[PDB]
Coordinates of C-alpha atoms in Angstrom, one line a residue:
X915 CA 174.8 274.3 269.3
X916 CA 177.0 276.7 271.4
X917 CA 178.3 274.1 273.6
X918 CA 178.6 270.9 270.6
X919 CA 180.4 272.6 268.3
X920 CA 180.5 270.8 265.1
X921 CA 182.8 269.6 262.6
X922 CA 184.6 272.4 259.9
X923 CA 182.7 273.4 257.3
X924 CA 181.4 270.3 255.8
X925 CA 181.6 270.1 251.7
X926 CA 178.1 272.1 250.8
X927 CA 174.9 270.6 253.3
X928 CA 173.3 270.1 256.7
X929 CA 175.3 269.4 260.0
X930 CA 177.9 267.0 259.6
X931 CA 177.8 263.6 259.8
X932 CA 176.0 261.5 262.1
X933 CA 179.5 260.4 264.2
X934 CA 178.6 261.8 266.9
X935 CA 176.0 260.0 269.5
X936 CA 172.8 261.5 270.9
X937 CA 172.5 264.9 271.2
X938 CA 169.6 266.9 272.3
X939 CA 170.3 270.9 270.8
X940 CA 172.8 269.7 268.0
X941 CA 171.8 266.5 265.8
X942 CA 174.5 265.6 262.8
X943 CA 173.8 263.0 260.4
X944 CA 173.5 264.7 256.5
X945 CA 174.3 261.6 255.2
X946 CA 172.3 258.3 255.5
X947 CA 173.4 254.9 256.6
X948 CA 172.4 251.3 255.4
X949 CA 169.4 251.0 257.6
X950 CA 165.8 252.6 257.9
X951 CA 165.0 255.9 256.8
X952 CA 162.6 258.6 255.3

């Protein structure tokens, strides 16, 4: 973090979402899309 700083305080979870692209320290995405995952 430190130089990405992230969205507010996001409603109870992990990072925010994943809006923002790449990102090697920080890495949003609490939320899941409609494609591969784990």
């Amino acid at each position: 973090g430190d130089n990405k700083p992230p969205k507010k305080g996001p409603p109870n979870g992990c990072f925010g979402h994943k809006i923002d692209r790449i990102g090697s320290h920080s890495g949003l995405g609490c939320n899941k899309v409609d494609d591969n995952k784990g």
